[PDB]
């Protein structure tokens, strides 16, 4: 059960919030307000928005002290293990992430 | 300073190139972690996503659209994962920005 403070950032285009099931000491989520259901259904008109989401993710990673490194993840469909059909960019840090990435 | 990606870009190191335009290049990963594993890289030598800037917004969006379009062309219809690694903890080993696209198998959770 999350609190309003779990929203780390918001603007006209996107929301950033903590993952209530964190896979790392820091784990948050960047989503567009426009309900793109999955990255495979993004269209060319979404180019600037998609760019903005990545920029927001990295700015927030800095704000959350992920200077020693972090991982950005976007899941698509069943094989990507996408759990909600709204676009999510995962940002994970604060521990050594492994390889392969799942 | 120049990573091995500099050779892939100038074509001195042969690669299985899936797509190219003036802004980016797409090629198969030679150490694949999935049945399909390719990389989308900018031609602009951004070393890592933490060093991208506001004027790279459009380029970053373009990289994602190219990733998704190429995923389609590779038949990743049942799904796939996009990964960007930054720095040591992210397990970044090549310091030229690149998006991994992995598909053709079930991806697990957590993502590393
Ligand atoms: N068995 C392994 C071990 C390491 N790496 C390198 C990979 C993860 O460290 O590089 C991630 P990048 O810098 O985002 O390509 C690999 O490709 N295979
Ligand atoms: Cl997800």
Coordinates of C-alpha atoms and ligand atoms in Angstrom, one line a residue:
Chain A
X1 CA 0.0 0.0 0.0
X2 CA 1.7 3.1 -1.3
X3 CA 1.6 6.7 -0.1
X4 CA 1.5 10.0 -2.1
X5 CA 5.2 10.4 -1.3
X6 CA 5.9 7.2 -3.3
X7 CA 5.3 9.5 -6.3
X8 CA 8.8 10.7 -6.9
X9 CA 8.1 13.0 -9.9
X10 CA 5.1 14.2 -12.0
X11 CA 4.6 16.5 -14.9
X12 CA 2.1 16.9 -17.7
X13 CA 3.6 13.9 -19.5
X14 CA 4.5 11.2 -17.0
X15 CA 4.5 9.9 -13.4
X16 CA 7.3 8.3 -11.5
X17 CA 6.6 6.0 -8.5
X18 CA 8.3 3.4 -6.3
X19 CA 7.7 -0.3 -7.0
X20 CA 5.8 -1.8 -4.0
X21 CA 7.6 -5.1 -4.9
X22 CA 11.2 -3.9 -5.2
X23 CA 13.8 -6.1 -6.8
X24 CA 16.6 -3.9 -5.7
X25 CA 17.3 -1.5 -2.8
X26 CA 16.1 1.2 -5.2
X27 CA 13.4 0.3 -7.7
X28 CA 11.0 2.8 -9.2
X29 CA 8.7 3.1 -12.2
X30 CA 8.3 5.7 -15.0
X31 CA 5.0 5.7 -16.8
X32 CA 3.4 8.0 -19.4
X33 CA 0.1 9.6 -18.6
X34 CA -0.9 8.7 -22.2
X35 CA -1.9 5.0 -21.9
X36 CA 0.4 3.4 -24.3
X37 CA -0.3 -0.3 -23.4
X38 CA 3.1 -1.6 -24.4
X39 CA 6.2 -0.5 -26.1
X40 CA 5.4 -2.6 -29.2
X41 CA 2.3 -0.4 -29.6
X42 CA 4.1 2.9 -29.4
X43 CA 3.9 4.9 -32.6
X44 CA 6.0 7.5 -34.3
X45 CA 4.0 10.3 -32.8
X46 CA 5.2 9.1 -29.4
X47 CA 8.9 9.8 -30.2
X48 CA 9.4 12.9 -28.1
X49 CA 7.4 11.4 -25.2
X50 CA 9.5 8.2 -25.2
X51 CA 12.6 10.3 -25.2
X52 CA 11.2 12.3 -22.3
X53 CA 10.5 9.2 -20.2
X54 CA 14.2 8.0 -20.5
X55 CA 15.4 11.5 -19.5
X56 CA 13.1 11.5 -16.5
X57 CA 14.3 8.1 -15.6
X58 CA 18.0 9.1 -15.6
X59 CA 17.3 12.4 -13.8
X60 CA 15.4 10.5 -11.1
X61 CA 18.2 7.9 -10.9
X62 CA 20.6 10.7 -10.0
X63 CA 18.1 12.1 -7.5
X64 CA 17.9 8.7 -5.9
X65 CA 21.7 8.4 -5.6
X66 CA 22.3 5.7 -8.3
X67 CA 25.7 7.1 -9.2
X68 CA 27.5 3.7 -9.0
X69 CA 25.1 2.5 -11.7
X70 CA 21.6 1.2 -12.5
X71 CA 19.5 -0.7 -15.0
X72 CA 16.5 0.4 -17.1
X73 CA 14.1 -2.3 -18.1
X74 CA 11.0 -2.3 -20.4
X75 CA 8.9 -5.5 -20.5
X76 CA 6.7 -6.3 -23.5
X77 CA 4.1 -9.0 -23.6
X78 CA 4.1 -12.5 -22.0
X79 CA 7.7 -13.3 -22.7
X80 CA 8.9 -10.0 -21.4
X81 CA 7.0 -10.8 -18.2
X82 CA 4.9 -7.6 -18.6
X83 CA 2.3 -7.6 -15.7
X84 CA 0.3 -4.5 -16.4
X85 CA -0.7 -3.4 -19.9
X86 CA 0.4 0.2 -19.5
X87 CA 3.9 1.3 -20.5
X88 CA 6.4 1.0 -17.6
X89 CA 10.1 1.8 -17.5
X90 CA 11.7 0.1 -14.5
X91 CA 14.8 1.6 -12.9
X92 CA 16.8 -0.6 -10.5
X93 CA 19.9 0.2 -8.5
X94 CA 21.7 0.0 -5.2
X95 CA 22.9 -3.5 -5.7
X96 CA 25.0 -5.3 -8.3
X97 CA 22.6 -6.3 -11.1
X98 CA 23.4 -9.6 -12.7
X99 CA 23.7 -10.8 -16.3
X100 CA 21.7 -12.1 -18.2
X101 CA 18.9 -9.6 -17.2
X102 CA 16.4 -12.3 -16.6
Chain B
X1 CA 38.2 6.3 -25.6
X2 CA 36.7 4.5 -28.6
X3 CA 34.9 1.3 -27.6
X4 CA 34.7 -1.8 -29.9
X5 CA 31.4 -0.2 -31.1
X6 CA 33.5 2.3 -33.0
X7 CA 34.7 -0.5 -35.3
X8 CA 31.1 -1.8 -35.8
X9 CA 30.1 1.7 -36.7
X10 CA 32.9 2.3 -39.2
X11 CA 32.4 -1.3 -40.5
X12 CA 36.0 -2.4 -39.9
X13 CA 34.5 -5.2 -37.7
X14 CA 31.8 -7.2 -39.6
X15 CA 28.5 -7.4 -37.8
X16 CA 25.1 -8.7 -38.6
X17 CA 23.4 -5.3 -39.2
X18 CA 19.7 -5.3 -38.9
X19 CA 19.0 -1.6 -39.5
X20 CA 20.9 1.6 -40.1
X21 CA 20.2 5.3 -40.6
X22 CA 22.1 8.5 -39.9
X23 CA 21.2 8.5 -36.2
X24 CA 21.6 4.8 -35.2
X25 CA 22.7 1.3 -36.0
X26 CA 21.2 -2.0 -35.0
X27 CA 23.2 -5.3 -34.9
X28 CA 23.1 -8.7 -33.4
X29 CA 24.8 -9.3 -30.1
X30 CA 27.7 -11.8 -30.5
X31 CA 27.3 -13.1 -27.0
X32 CA 23.5 -13.6 -27.1
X33 CA 21.6 -14.2 -23.9
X34 CA 18.4 -15.1 -25.7
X35 CA 17.4 -16.7 -29.1
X36 CA 17.1 -13.2 -30.4
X37 CA 19.5 -10.6 -28.9
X38 CA 20.3 -7.4 -30.8
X39 CA 21.6 -4.0 -29.8
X40 CA 20.4 -0.6 -30.8
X41 CA 23.1 2.1 -30.6
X42 CA 23.2 5.8 -31.4
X43 CA 25.9 7.0 -33.8
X44 CA 26.5 9.9 -31.4
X45 CA 29.0 8.4 -28.9
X46 CA 27.0 8.9 -25.7
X47 CA 28.9 6.8 -23.2
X48 CA 26.0 5.9 -20.9
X49 CA 22.4 6.9 -20.3
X50 CA 23.4 8.9 -17.2
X51 CA 25.4 11.2 -19.5
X52 CA 22.5 11.7 -22.0
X53 CA 21.1 15.3 -22.0
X54 CA 18.0 17.2 -22.9
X55 CA 19.1 17.8 -26.5
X56 CA 19.3 13.9 -26.9
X57 CA 15.5 13.6 -26.2
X58 CA 14.5 13.0 -29.7
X59 CA 17.4 10.6 -30.4
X60 CA 16.5 8.6 -27.3
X61 CA 12.9 8.3 -28.4
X62 CA 14.1 7.3 -31.9
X63 CA 16.3 4.5 -30.4
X64 CA 13.2 3.1 -28.6
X65 CA 11.0 3.2 -31.8
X66 CA 13.8 1.6 -33.8
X67 CA 14.1 -1.1 -31.0
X68 CA 10.4 -1.8 -31.2
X69 CA 10.3 -1.8 -35.0
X70 CA 13.2 -4.2 -35.3
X71 CA 11.6 -6.4 -32.6
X72 CA 8.6 -6.7 -34.9
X73 CA 10.8 -7.5 -37.9
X74 CA 12.5 -10.3 -35.8
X75 CA 9.2 -11.8 -34.9
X76 CA 9.1 -11.1 -31.2
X77 CA 5.3 -11.0 -31.3
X78 CA 4.9 -13.0 -28.0
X79 CA 7.0 -10.4 -26.2
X80 CA 10.5 -9.2 -25.4
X81 CA 12.6 -7.1 -23.0
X82 CA 14.5 -3.9 -23.5
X83 CA 17.5 -3.3 -21.2
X84 CA 19.8 -0.3 -20.8
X85 CA 22.8 -0.7 -18.4
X86 CA 24.5 2.2 -16.7
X87 CA 27.8 1.9 -14.8
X88 CA 29.3 -0.9 -12.7
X89 CA 26.2 -1.8 -10.7
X90 CA 24.1 -1.9 -13.9
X91 CA 26.8 -4.3 -15.2
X92 CA 27.6 -2.0 -18.1
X93 CA 30.7 -3.3 -19.8
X94 CA 30.8 -1.3 -23.0
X95 CA 30.7 2.5 -22.5
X96 CA 28.8 3.4 -25.6
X97 CA 25.1 3.8 -25.0
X98 CA 23.1 0.8 -26.2
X99 CA 19.7 -0.8 -25.8
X100 CA 19.6 -4.6 -25.6
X101 CA 16.6 -6.3 -27.2
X102 CA 16.0 -9.8 -25.9
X103 CA 13.3 -12.2 -27.2
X104 CA 12.5 -15.7 -28.3
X105 CA 12.4 -17.1 -24.8
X106 CA 10.7 -16.5 -21.5
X107 CA 12.4 -13.6 -19.7
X108 CA 12.5 -14.1 -15.9
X109 CA 12.1 -11.8 -13.0
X110 CA 13.9 -10.0 -11.4
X111 CA 15.8 -8.8 -14.5
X112 CA 19.2 -9.6 -13.1
Ligands
LIG1 N1 28.5 -14.0 -19.6 C1 28.6 -12.6 -19.8 C2 29.1 -11.7 -18.8 C3 29.2 -10.4 -19.1 N2 28.8 -9.8 -20.2 C4 28.8 -8.4 -20.5 C5 27.5 -7.7 -20.3 C6 27.1 -7.7 -18.8 O1 28.2 -7.3 -18.0 O2 27.6 -6.3 -20.7 C7 26.4 -5.5 -20.5 P1 26.4 -4.0 -21.6 O3 27.7 -3.2 -21.3 O4 25.1 -3.4 -21.2 O5 26.5 -4.6 -23.0 C8 28.3 -10.7 -21.2 O6 27.9 -10.2 -22.4 N3 28.2 -12.0 -21.0
LIG2 CL1 6.2 -4.5 -16.3

